[PDB]
Each structure stands twice: as C-alpha cells, then as structure tokens.
C-alpha cells in the first residue's frame, strides 16, 4: 500500500557530487577531481 520505487540510474556513470555524466567511468573518476582539493583550514599566518 505504497508507491513502489525502481531505477537506480540507467545512465552509465554520473557524478554524485555535481551530476555530470560520462559515458566512460574513467572520464568521471578523473573528473571528480575537479571537486576534491582546494580545501584550506582557515587562515595560514605563515
Ligand atoms: Zn562532478
């Protein structure tokens, strides 16, 4: 007695970070990089 769910992501490979899709996983894995990094911890003072 409830709406049944179905379908995870027909797409080949999507970026759970932004949502970009890449036919080839390799393209995605490498892309995800654009996200990681550039995460400083406040001021440096050095
Ligand atoms: Zn992304």
Curated annotation (Swiss-Prot):
A zinc finger (C2H2-type) spans 13-35. It is found in: Nucleus. May be involved in transcriptional regulation. Belongs to the krueppel C2H2-type zinc-finger protein family. This is Zinc finger protein 347.
């Amino acid at each position: 007695g409830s709406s049944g769910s179905s379908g995870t992501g027909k797409k080949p490979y999507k970026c759970n970070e932004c949502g970009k899709v890449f036919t080839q996983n390799s393209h995605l894995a490498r892309h995800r990089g654009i996200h990681t990094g550039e995460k400083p911890s406040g001021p440096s003072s050095g």
